[PDB]
Amino acid sequence: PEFLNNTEPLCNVSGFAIVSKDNGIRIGSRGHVFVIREPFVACGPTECRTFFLTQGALLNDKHSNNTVKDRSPYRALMSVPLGSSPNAYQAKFESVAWSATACHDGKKWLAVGISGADDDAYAVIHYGGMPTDVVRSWRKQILRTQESSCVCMNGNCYWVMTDGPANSQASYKIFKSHEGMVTNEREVSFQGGHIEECSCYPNLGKVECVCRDNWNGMNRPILIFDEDLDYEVGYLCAGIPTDTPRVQDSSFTGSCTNAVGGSGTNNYGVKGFGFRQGNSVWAGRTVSISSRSGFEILLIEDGWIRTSKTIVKKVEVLNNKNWSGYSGAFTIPITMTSKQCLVPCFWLEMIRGKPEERTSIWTSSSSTVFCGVSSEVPGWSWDDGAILPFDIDK
Amino acid sequence: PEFLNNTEPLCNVSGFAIVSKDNGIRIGSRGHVFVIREPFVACGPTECRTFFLTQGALLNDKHSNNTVKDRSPYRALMSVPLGSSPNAYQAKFESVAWSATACHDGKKWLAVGISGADDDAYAVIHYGGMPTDVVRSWRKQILRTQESSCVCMNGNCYWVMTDGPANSQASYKIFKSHEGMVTNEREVSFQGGHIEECSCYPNLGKVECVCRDNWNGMNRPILIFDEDLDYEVGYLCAGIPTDTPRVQDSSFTGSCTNAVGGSGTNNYGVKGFGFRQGNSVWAGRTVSISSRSGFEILLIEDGWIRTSKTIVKKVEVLNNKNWSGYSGAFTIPITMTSKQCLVPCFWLEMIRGKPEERTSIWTSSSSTVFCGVSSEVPGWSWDDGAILPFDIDK
Amino acid sequence: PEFLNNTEPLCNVSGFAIVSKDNGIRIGSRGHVFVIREPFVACGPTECRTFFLTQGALLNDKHSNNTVKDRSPYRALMSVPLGSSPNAYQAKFESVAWSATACHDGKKWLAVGISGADDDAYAVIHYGGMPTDVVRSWRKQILRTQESSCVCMNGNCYWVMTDGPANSQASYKIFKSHEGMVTNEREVSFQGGHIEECSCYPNLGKVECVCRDNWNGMNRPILIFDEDLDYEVGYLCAGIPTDTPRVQDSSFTGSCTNAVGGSGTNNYGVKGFGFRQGNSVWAGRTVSISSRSGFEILLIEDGWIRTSKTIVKKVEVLNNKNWSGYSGAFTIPITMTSKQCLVPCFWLEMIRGKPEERTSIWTSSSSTVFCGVSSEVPGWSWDDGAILPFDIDK
Amino acid sequence: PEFLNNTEPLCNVSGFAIVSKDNGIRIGSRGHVFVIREPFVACGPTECRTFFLTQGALLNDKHSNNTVKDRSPYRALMSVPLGSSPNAYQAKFESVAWSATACHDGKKWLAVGISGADDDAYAVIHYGGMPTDVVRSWRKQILRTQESSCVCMNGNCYWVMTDGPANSQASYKIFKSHEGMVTNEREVSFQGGHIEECSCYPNLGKVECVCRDNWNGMNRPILIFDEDLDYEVGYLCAGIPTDTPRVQDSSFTGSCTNAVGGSGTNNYGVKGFGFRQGNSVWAGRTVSISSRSGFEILLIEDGWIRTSKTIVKKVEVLNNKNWSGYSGAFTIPITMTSKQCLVPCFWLEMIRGKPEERTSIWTSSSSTVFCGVSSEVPGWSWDDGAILPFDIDK
Ligand SMILES: *[C@@H]1O[C@H](CO)[C@@H](O[C@@H]2O[C@H](CO)[C@@H](O)[C@H](O)[C@H]2NC(C)=O)[C@H](O)[C@H]1NC(C)=O
Ligand SMILES: *[C@@H]1O[C@H](CO)[C@@H](O[C@@H]2O[C@H](CO)[C@@H](O)[C@H](O)[C@H]2NC(C)=O)[C@H](O)[C@H]1NC(C)=O
Ligand SMILES: *[C@@H]1O[C@H](CO)[C@@H](O[C@@H]2O[C@H](CO)[C@@H](O)[C@H](O)[C@H]2NC(C)=O)[C@H](O)[C@H]1NC(C)=O
Ligand SMILES: *[C@@H]1O[C@H](CO)[C@@H](O[C@@H]2O[C@H](CO)[C@@H](O)[C@H](O)[C@H]2NC(C)=O)[C@H](O)[C@H]1NC(C)=O
Ligand SMILES: CC(=O)N[C@H]1[C@H]([C@H](O)[C@H](O)CO)OC(C(=O)O)=C[C@@H]1NC(=N)N
Ligand SMILES: CC(=O)N[C@H]1[C@H]([C@H](O)[C@H](O)CO)OC(C(=O)O)=C[C@@H]1NC(=N)N
Ligand SMILES: CC(=O)N[C@H]1[C@H]([C@H](O)[C@H](O)CO)OC(C(=O)O)=C[C@@H]1NC(=N)N
Ligand SMILES: CC(=O)N[C@H]1[C@H]([C@H](O)[C@H](O)CO)OC(C(=O)O)=C[C@@H]1NC(=N)N
Ligand SMILES: *[C@@H]1O[C@H](CO)[C@@H](O)[C@H](O)[C@H]1NC(C)=O
Ligand SMILES: *[C@@H]1O[C@H](CO)[C@@H](O)[C@H](O)[C@H]1NC(C)=O
Ligand SMILES: *[C@@H]1O[C@H](CO)[C@@H](O)[C@H](O)[C@H]1NC(C)=O
Ligand SMILES: *[C@@H]1O[C@H](CO)[C@@H](O)[C@H](O)[C@H]1NC(C)=O
Ligand SMILES: [Ca+2]
Ligand SMILES: [Ca+2]
Ligand SMILES: [Ca+2]
Ligand SMILES: [Ca+2]
């Protein structure tokens, strides 16, 4: 067992092929499957796993009542092999958590799980299944993190956390760890900007993150940092907005530096992702500009470096008649691919129940996962597929 | 870990002994078992596994409604150890798929799963659990493959795919891969012939396939190819027809070269198998000439090389009062047998529900598996055994 | 991985301590647990496992109806780790079987499973999970075997089979195998005797078996054989009868050579066991002389070599107010104990449902397991504990 | 595989961070989860596991009736990975047991399980899953042990047992074992004292235990011993009482030598724990002085060596509106932490059902687990979270 370098360039890809679909909610109509949300994927040297935040309750059970709620003492980070339902008997316990990130350094799994009261939460860092360190809330206002994979390079693992208001200026920090111990941290200066739920991946030895602005931006913040935690922060340059809510493309003008918002888009957002491709960018977004429905990915020419509106490729993986949700980035290491570059992949959360489906008492999600390939790949619509309401709703 | 040679001759066998029976539908009356169809078996160096296409739903659940349907975004290729039910908690996710093939090269599992729209489907190739390559539909008409084990020899794995009409001339291709990457392909010229759902096995360093003609043939196509993808294509010579539907043996005249059909047998078929035995052949077939009921295997003297009607052995493993379905071939590698030849085995799918059992809202199947041995073995009737209708049907 | 020698002497023990209890039927009131019977235990170098014959159906399901029946195409030999319930999700498939034996040679598991029609059954031998050989019925009358662990010594594994009438002279054979291939067999001459369901264990390089006479004997046959399959056959000498049904001890006179029966005890029996202890013997029996209720084990002074009635120790592990059933012998190898002798252990089957509990539609069993120790150990009553009837019975 | 030294000093810690929460009862509302009580945690070189005593029955099943009862033939010690629910399909069988202790010596798991009649019980010692030795009741009055992790150092494992009256002078013994064999024992002279359910941990090569006095003490006995089983015995000096029931702190005067009781606190207690910190002590207790509700941990200055009332730190992990129960100590070995000291951790049992919740027919518990860290950590209330009554209660 050796540490993964993970210092290779990110692969350039021309399409995204479906890798898995867990069908968790369909299965949970009868099987014993956790109510969850905030799923994500992370890969070790030999296996990829799906992580998720349970509600400490099962689908179609009375304890699934009121699971639209975000935080409780019953939520836990757990994982299953990629493609498995988040079920009661395969789930591996990772951390107590209502917010989390996880990744593998080549030797062991790192899991960071936040629990506790809103005004005094703390992250517990688990390494190889053992609690190694803690990070306390420094602003005492819902300490929270990525809800996707962290990044490990050369034995050091990195992640981003936020503490402070949901709809105004908050505080943003980058963390560095080795074998589960925090070894460095840096506060990111981003006045007028808002960073949450970063989707991060390694690219040529740096960590590149595409995040959620829940304040004044319908464009996505970009945060790039190195091993010293030196950073650049700004917004995805592209003249195509990729948060939700947002306005139609023709009503939007991009910015590399400033949050662009207004027009009824302020004070909300959704976790999402993008992948730099030289000067261009693959960016995901819901099909709807107002709701978490549909999902498509766009290749925007020069979209990483300028306010480009040129869409060279677009692929839809979920049509607008179906519910989506969070999306996030991860990479496949050289040990599984034998390539000289890191393969970019994304996952998609499909939320069922509240608030969009009010005749259900619960909220959960299922997922699809896609990986970049060297050729164009057709889209389709791989929807959650569950038939609501469920038994427990009647 | 080294690649399996798999270049040995196929064993000559005199009988087939039952190896496993999963009783999946009986168990799924109460247990949590996937609705499936198209099961198959493939063996690695140290383990054999049962693969299957789920419907992304469980038996006796409302989501099992309308599962007679062949393709959807919810179907997945999964696997369990040989003999296990295809259940919710042991199932290993392999690929998103409504058509599939899988095999083991000695080092890792290869799984090929087709999903997407009928007019723009694509296969995703998974190797060691990682997506490595894709194959796009080239005729834009239900790209489809074996629904049984592919063949690996000396580190290269091979499979057959079809694209085009179900009931007229289509296009047939052979694929070669190494570590999950397609390295060669060849289109098979077969004018007037139709190839689907090939059952393939290694024999003296070549791949021998017995397939389904869904057009004008009640005899089975035979496709034989080598590492260069050079091939011979034709029909099983035997003057005994082995597709379903077919006519009675006495109304049939064999052909090595031509599809023999008519008499109400055109435009359908069932996946099946055969094993060359020198110049002879073991071939499976349903007992009924018109429906998927019963199952028997026949040793036909010189049936691989001429229009022989001489049946030297016949063994029934399912009587005609019980539902059958697909059947397929696989082999056991030298690493498990210590023999100097590859052991021929077959599996049998037993379909319950629609269309034959109209009082059920669903369709699933269970399996039995048999392996060749050096002596004669008695038959019996190992039927699915489930008592229909089920709870969900009322 | 090397073959277990297993040529050590059997340990002398002064008591039996409980090792496990699976509580399978209690658990199966709600959990997903197979209907079974004929459980047994066998140990490999590093693990002991519980084997069992399922009915291919789960407790509290409609398919459990009529499971008092002994043979069907749906029965399978499966296994779980020692102490686990025989449940739907941990069970490992071993063989299709309505009669079976299994053991471990130090390198791999050997499983022998009999299925097929009563008049043409056959055993399939599985080695390392691969079908290696077959044994056909030679009398065409319910080929059957031990329903307990076989014995492996120096890489060869041995077991006993019977074919012929249940209530008159039948045919008895000993088998020798290496890596799953039958390498020798010997028919046992036993005129006027009847041998079924042998409980066998290694002792100083020979196999010692205590069996069931289902014909004229309420005393148990003893069969001892060596690697050449040379044998001695007779009855347990002790003047204490240990089959069921039997008469009270004071009405019984022992014999080393002859079946002793009559008085309403002919034509039935129950699988049981004994362990030679020098010239003495530990022998199990039901507490009731007429029914399968209660269980006790007796140390009979010189009971292996003469018609002794001297009981030096007696321990009850199940009181006569509770249902018992089959019992069987196995040993723990030196690799788990670091001893210079083989530890004798036994398991006890506790049958619930038909025929004793007529208000239930089903029959299943659970187990307790006990191992010999160097000191006296108190008894108790570890009964099945399920509360009948079950939901499905109403 | 080598034996763990475990001779390092115990770490000094300033706070306790939550490591896991199993949510077992919430999950068991629908999932298949054992009714349990007396959970505990023990760590091997590479994994921590949760152990528990089942009632041989599942939640929400009729067999859960009357599970307030402490002892039966159906109770078993089983384990799951840390954080998992004690469910029917992940549970590993360890021992038949209505009282137990378990630990890992670096090479194998040791499990000690007591079963049998109240007046003639015996412990079976399991090592590497094999029964190795027995300990008989020496006072014939409910032989019983820790219900938490034992301690292994340099290949020897130690635990404490009690036999005799629950509410008057009993007999207390320390045991030493190597590879599952008892190699030494010592009776502890403690006239007027009462020791049960010791929570023990290694500290600088000695075993330090904090126990339950069920007779005349609302203060906790302390037992410290070395490899020769030489011991010191007394009470936790602190002038803060930590048993339940107890009186308010201001009504209590500490003692290092004598049981301090009366005022309605005699003849009961609850399993609990403490950790020496130089001359100080971290000690757990229920928040309520009279009932098993709430849980807090206190750092008492010099509380190990004198009758101090100085509380320097206090952290609540369960508020007094929620049910608690047993608590216990364990340590994390150097192999998981790479530290030079042993990390102190504790678990908390949260009991639901009888006797406090009389509208339920059953009693079970779930757990939370916490580990010491080098900084202060906020508290919260991580309650069981199940909504009673359950289906089976109506
Ligand atoms: C992905 O594509 C980008 C853009 O084409 C590649 O970046 C170029 O790399 C070459 C070779 O070093 C340089 O000469 C160019 O200056 C780069 N262009 C830009 C815009 O950065 C990159 O090499 C590709 N990555 C991989 C892994 O193939
Ligand atoms: C299976 O049987 C076939 C037919 O008997 C065997 O093929 C023969 O092999 C011998 C030895 O090389 C040749 O002399 C013959 O010409 C072959 N006959 C035919 C019809 O091909 C084959 O060897 C057998 N296979 C195995 C593995 O034993
Ligand atoms: C079990 O007990 C028997 C009977 O006491 C032991 O058999 C004796 O072994 C000694 C030593 O070789 C011989 O001198 C005696 O002749 C034997 N007696 C009989 C009746 O066989 C045997 O050694 C013991 N087994 C073990 C493993 O300790
Ligand atoms: C935990 O704290 C205690 C108390 O401060 C430490 O014990 C001291 O150790 C030093 C160094 O050997 C001695 O000089 C003192 O006499 C000790 N004091 C007492 C009260 O025992 C102990 O070293 C600490 N343990 C660890 C692992 O850091
Ligand atoms: C820690 C916390 O509760 N995180 C929130 C998150 C949050 O409200 C926004 O980012 C605003 O700050 O939004 C949402 C969301 O669906 O919008 C889900 C999260 N749920 C959980 N991760 N549990
Ligand atoms: C891809 C596709 O849908 N394949 C079909 C197959 C097909 O219709 C025929 O071969 C004709 O082309 O027939 C049948 C069949 O039962 O006849 C099952 C298959 N179901 C699936 N593999 N899902
Ligand atoms: C193969 C067969 O059916 N074996 C029988 C066995 C048998 O009837 C007697 O030994 C008489 O021959 O008896 C019994 C028994 O409970 O008496 C259970 C067995 N059930 C099974 N092993 N399935
Ligand atoms: C062996 C036995 O039954 N141990 C008891 C224990 C005991 O009654 C007291 O310590 C008094 O002696 O108390 C309690 C308790 O909840 O107070 C649970 C235990 N339950 C079990 N471990 N099963
Ligand atoms: C969910 O909560 C609401 C409000 O308390 C209640 O009316 C409803 O019955 C609950 N559903 C269940 C299944 O408990
Ligand atoms: C299955 O579908 C049919 C037609 O939509 C419907 O009538 C029937 O009730 C469905 N069954 C279930 C269990 O939903
Ligand atoms: C079991 O079989 C009997 C006889 O056929 C029948 O009367 C009874 O209803 C059956 N029970 C179930 C649950 O099917
Ligand atoms: C539990 O036991 C009581 C007393 O015997 C009984 O009244 C009650 O119905 C039982 N509950 C169940 C589910 O059997
Ligand atoms: Ca926004
Ligand atoms: Ca046809
Ligand atoms: Ca008899
Ligand atoms: Ca007390």
PDB file of N, CA and C in Angstrom, chain A residues 32 34 55-56 58-63 73-74 89 93 115-117 120 122 124 126 130-131 136, chain D residues 18-21 23 26 29-32 83 87 90 336 376-378 380-383 385-387 389:
ATOM      1  N   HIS A  32     -35.151  -3.076   2.238  1.00  0.00           N
ATOM      2  CA  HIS A  32     -34.798  -2.280   3.396  1.00  0.00           C
ATOM      3  C   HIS A  32     -33.671  -1.339   3.025  1.00  0.00           C
ATOM      4  N   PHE A  34     -32.114   2.744   3.215  1.00  0.00           N
ATOM      5  CA  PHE A  34     -32.110   3.992   3.973  1.00  0.00           C
ATOM      6  C   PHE A  34     -32.776   5.128   3.215  1.00  0.00           C
ATOM      7  N   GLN A  55     -30.890   9.286   6.967  1.00  0.00           N
ATOM      8  CA  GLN A  55     -31.714   9.944   7.967  1.00  0.00           C
ATOM      9  C   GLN A  55     -31.927   9.008   9.161  1.00  0.00           C
ATOM     10  N   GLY A  56     -31.104   7.962   9.258  1.00  0.00           N
ATOM     11  CA  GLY A  56     -31.223   7.004  10.346  1.00  0.00           C
ATOM     12  C   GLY A  56     -32.584   6.338  10.370  1.00  0.00           C
ATOM     13  N   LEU A  58     -35.537   4.012   7.498  1.00  0.00           N
ATOM     14  CA  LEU A  58     -35.717   3.297   6.237  1.00  0.00           C
ATOM     15  C   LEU A  58     -36.928   3.792   5.449  1.00  0.00           C
ATOM     16  N   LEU A  59     -36.848   3.662   4.129  1.00  0.00           N
ATOM     17  CA  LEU A  59     -37.967   3.994   3.259  1.00  0.00           C
ATOM     18  C   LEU A  59     -39.196   3.169   3.598  1.00  0.00           C
ATOM     19  N   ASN A  60     -40.363   3.792   3.468  1.00  0.00           N
ATOM     20  CA  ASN A  60     -41.640   3.147   3.763  1.00  0.00           C
ATOM     21  C   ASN A  60     -41.837   2.796   5.235  1.00  0.00           C
ATOM     22  N   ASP A  61     -41.066   3.437   6.110  1.00  0.00           N
ATOM     23  CA  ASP A  61     -41.254   3.291   7.550  1.00  0.00           C
ATOM     24  C   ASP A  61     -41.683   4.619   8.165  1.00  0.00           C
ATOM     25  N   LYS A  62     -42.371   4.567   9.301  1.00  0.00           N
ATOM     26  CA  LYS A  62     -42.856   5.791   9.937  1.00  0.00           C
ATOM     27  C   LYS A  62     -41.738   6.768  10.303  1.00  0.00           C
ATOM     28  N   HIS A  63     -40.528   6.259  10.516  1.00  0.00           N
ATOM     29  CA  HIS A  63     -39.415   7.135  10.874  1.00  0.00           C
ATOM     30  C   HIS A  63     -38.932   7.971   9.691  1.00  0.00           C
ATOM     31  N   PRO A  73     -29.688  14.429  14.915  1.00  0.00           N
ATOM     32  CA  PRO A  73     -28.683  13.555  15.534  1.00  0.00           C
ATOM     33  C   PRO A  73     -28.681  12.150  14.934  1.00  0.00           C
ATOM     34  N   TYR A  74     -29.635  11.849  14.057  1.00  0.00           N
ATOM     35  CA  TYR A  74     -29.786  10.491  13.527  1.00  0.00           C
ATOM     36  C   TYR A  74     -29.135  10.306  12.161  1.00  0.00           C
ATOM     37  N   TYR A  89     -28.203  -3.490   4.948  1.00  0.00           N
ATOM     38  CA  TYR A  89     -27.355  -4.644   5.248  1.00  0.00           C
ATOM     39  C   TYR A  89     -26.003  -4.614   4.550  1.00  0.00           C
ATOM     40  N   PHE A  93     -20.812   1.864   7.962  1.00  0.00           N
ATOM     41  CA  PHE A  93     -20.848   3.100   8.734  1.00  0.00           C
ATOM     42  C   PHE A  93     -19.520   3.847   8.620  1.00  0.00           C
ATOM     43  N   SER A 115     -21.392  16.849  12.846  1.00  0.00           N
ATOM     44  CA  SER A 115     -22.628  16.724  13.603  1.00  0.00           C
ATOM     45  C   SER A 115     -22.624  17.736  14.747  1.00  0.00           C
ATOM     46  N   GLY A 116     -23.630  17.669  15.611  1.00  0.00           N
ATOM     47  CA  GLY A 116     -23.763  18.621  16.699  1.00  0.00           C
ATOM     48  C   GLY A 116     -24.806  19.683  16.416  1.00  0.00           C
ATOM     49  N   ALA A 117     -24.962  20.602  17.365  1.00  0.00           N
ATOM     50  CA  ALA A 117     -25.919  21.695  17.247  1.00  0.00           C
ATOM     51  C   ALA A 117     -25.508  22.687  16.164  1.00  0.00           C
ATOM     52  N   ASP A 120     -22.848  25.084  17.354  1.00  0.00           N
ATOM     53  CA  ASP A 120     -21.617  24.557  17.933  1.00  0.00           C
ATOM     54  C   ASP A 120     -21.307  23.178  17.368  1.00  0.00           C
ATOM     55  N   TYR A 122     -19.263  20.277  15.035  1.00  0.00           N
ATOM     56  CA  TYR A 122     -17.867  19.932  14.812  1.00  0.00           C
ATOM     57  C   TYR A 122     -17.725  18.764  13.853  1.00  0.00           C
ATOM     58  N   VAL A 124     -15.760  15.434  12.765  1.00  0.00           N
ATOM     59  CA  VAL A 124     -14.876  14.381  13.236  1.00  0.00           C
ATOM     60  C   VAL A 124     -14.207  13.774  12.016  1.00  0.00           C
ATOM     61  N   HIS A 126     -12.260  10.780  10.375  1.00  0.00           N
ATOM     62  CA  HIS A 126     -12.057   9.349  10.538  1.00  0.00           C
ATOM     63  C   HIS A 126     -11.039   8.910   9.503  1.00  0.00           C
ATOM     64  N   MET A 130     -10.838   5.003  12.169  1.00  0.00           N
ATOM     65  CA  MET A 130     -10.541   5.466  13.514  1.00  0.00           C
ATOM     66  C   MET A 130     -10.642   6.981  13.584  1.00  0.00           C
ATOM     67  N   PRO A 131     -11.241   7.505  14.662  1.00  0.00           N
ATOM     68  CA  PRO A 131     -11.313   8.962  14.823  1.00  0.00           C
ATOM     69  C   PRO A 131      -9.919   9.513  15.118  1.00  0.00           C
ATOM     70  N   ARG A 136     -13.534  22.229  14.879  1.00  0.00           N
ATOM     71  CA  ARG A 136     -14.671  22.904  15.479  1.00  0.00           C
ATOM     72  C   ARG A 136     -15.191  24.029  14.603  1.00  0.00           C
TER      73      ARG A 136
ATOM     74  N   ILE D  18     -17.842  12.370  19.095  1.00  0.00           N
ATOM     75  CA  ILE D  18     -18.677  11.238  18.717  1.00  0.00           C
ATOM     76  C   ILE D  18     -18.067  10.491  17.530  1.00  0.00           C
ATOM     77  N   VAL D  19     -18.048   9.167  17.629  1.00  0.00           N
ATOM     78  CA  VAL D  19     -17.441   8.313  16.616  1.00  0.00           C
ATOM     79  C   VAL D  19     -18.498   7.570  15.819  1.00  0.00           C
ATOM     80  N   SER D  20     -19.543   7.118  16.499  1.00  0.00           N
ATOM     81  CA  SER D  20     -20.596   6.382  15.809  1.00  0.00           C
ATOM     82  C   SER D  20     -21.923   6.441  16.542  1.00  0.00           C
ATOM     83  N   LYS D  21     -22.979   6.138  15.799  1.00  0.00           N
ATOM     84  CA  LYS D  21     -24.316   5.995  16.344  1.00  0.00           C
ATOM     85  C   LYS D  21     -25.017   4.982  15.456  1.00  0.00           C
ATOM     86  N   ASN D  23     -28.302   3.781  15.517  1.00  0.00           N
ATOM     87  CA  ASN D  23     -29.714   4.008  15.194  1.00  0.00           C
ATOM     88  C   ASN D  23     -30.488   2.706  15.028  1.00  0.00           C
ATOM     89  N   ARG D  26     -34.505   2.653  15.576  1.00  0.00           N
ATOM     90  CA  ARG D  26     -35.151   3.353  14.463  1.00  0.00           C
ATOM     91  C   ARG D  26     -35.171   2.471  13.217  1.00  0.00           C
ATOM     92  N   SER D  29     -37.541  -0.602  13.202  1.00  0.00           N
ATOM     93  CA  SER D  29     -38.971  -0.373  13.027  1.00  0.00           C
ATOM     94  C   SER D  29     -39.449  -1.087  11.757  1.00  0.00           C
ATOM     95  N   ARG D  30     -38.552  -1.216  10.782  1.00  0.00           N
ATOM     96  CA  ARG D  30     -38.886  -1.875   9.518  1.00  0.00           C
ATOM     97  C   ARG D  30     -37.865  -2.948   9.130  1.00  0.00           C
ATOM     98  N   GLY D  31     -36.589  -2.659   9.368  1.00  0.00           N
ATOM     99  CA  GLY D  31     -35.526  -3.593   9.051  1.00  0.00           C
ATOM    100  C   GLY D  31     -35.498  -4.748  10.034  1.00  0.00           C
ATOM    101  N   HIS D  32     -34.634  -5.719   9.762  1.00  0.00           N
ATOM    102  CA  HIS D  32     -34.549  -6.916  10.574  1.00  0.00           C
ATOM    103  C   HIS D  32     -33.372  -6.790  11.519  1.00  0.00           C
ATOM    104  N   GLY D  83     -20.697   0.893  14.417  1.00  0.00           N
ATOM    105  CA  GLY D  83     -21.618   1.806  13.767  1.00  0.00           C
ATOM    106  C   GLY D  83     -22.776   1.131  13.059  1.00  0.00           C
ATOM    107  N   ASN D  87     -28.018  -6.112  13.233  1.00  0.00           N
ATOM    108  CA  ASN D  87     -29.040  -6.691  12.363  1.00  0.00           C
ATOM    109  C   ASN D  87     -28.857  -8.170  12.031  1.00  0.00           C
ATOM    110  N   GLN D  90     -25.864  -9.013   9.134  1.00  0.00           N
ATOM    111  CA  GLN D  90     -24.459  -8.657   9.332  1.00  0.00           C
ATOM    112  C   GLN D  90     -23.900  -9.259  10.616  1.00  0.00           C
ATOM    113  N   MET D 336      -3.686   1.574  15.163  1.00  0.00           N
ATOM    114  CA  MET D 336      -4.659   2.355  14.407  1.00  0.00           C
ATOM    115  C   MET D 336      -4.404   3.854  14.518  1.00  0.00           C
ATOM    116  N   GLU D 376     -10.927  20.442  23.558  1.00  0.00           N
ATOM    117  CA  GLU D 376     -12.303  20.466  24.033  1.00  0.00           C
ATOM    118  C   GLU D 376     -13.272  20.297  22.873  1.00  0.00           C
ATOM    119  N   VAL D 377     -14.345  19.554  23.121  1.00  0.00           N
ATOM    120  CA  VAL D 377     -15.337  19.258  22.102  1.00  0.00           C
ATOM    121  C   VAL D 377     -16.717  19.547  22.679  1.00  0.00           C
ATOM    122  N   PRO D 378     -17.572  20.238  21.911  1.00  0.00           N
ATOM    123  CA  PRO D 378     -18.920  20.553  22.392  1.00  0.00           C
ATOM    124  C   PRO D 378     -19.745  19.285  22.574  1.00  0.00           C
ATOM    125  N   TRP D 380     -23.843  17.562  22.739  1.00  0.00           N
ATOM    126  CA  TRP D 380     -25.136  17.693  22.087  1.00  0.00           C
ATOM    127  C   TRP D 380     -26.016  16.630  22.719  1.00  0.00           C
ATOM    128  N   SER D 381     -27.114  16.284  22.068  1.00  0.00           N
ATOM    129  CA  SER D 381     -27.926  15.184  22.552  1.00  0.00           C
ATOM    130  C   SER D 381     -28.214  14.241  21.400  1.00  0.00           C
ATOM    131  N   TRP D 382     -27.467  13.147  21.342  1.00  0.00           N
ATOM    132  CA  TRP D 382     -27.674  12.138  20.313  1.00  0.00           C
ATOM    133  C   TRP D 382     -28.501  11.006  20.906  1.00  0.00           C
ATOM    134  N   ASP D 383     -29.815  11.189  20.923  1.00  0.00           N
ATOM    135  CA  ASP D 383     -30.709  10.225  21.551  1.00  0.00           C
ATOM    136  C   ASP D 383     -31.027   9.046  20.636  1.00  0.00           C
ATOM    137  N   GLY D 385     -33.828   7.919  19.436  1.00  0.00           N
ATOM    138  CA  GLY D 385     -34.583   8.497  18.340  1.00  0.00           C
ATOM    139  C   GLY D 385     -35.765   7.693  17.831  1.00  0.00           C
ATOM    140  N   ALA D 386     -35.976   6.496  18.375  1.00  0.00           N
ATOM    141  CA  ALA D 386     -37.114   5.686  17.954  1.00  0.00           C
ATOM    142  C   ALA D 386     -38.434   6.258  18.475  1.00  0.00           C
ATOM    143  N   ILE D 387     -39.485   6.099  17.678  1.00  0.00           N
ATOM    144  CA  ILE D 387     -40.815   6.559  18.032  1.00  0.00           C
ATOM    145  C   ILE D 387     -41.643   5.376  18.519  1.00  0.00           C
ATOM    146  N   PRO D 389     -45.043   3.830  20.868  1.00  0.00           N
ATOM    147  CA  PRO D 389     -44.887   2.374  20.740  1.00  0.00           C
ATOM    148  C   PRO D 389     -44.648   1.941  19.302  1.00  0.00           C
TER     149      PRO D 389
END
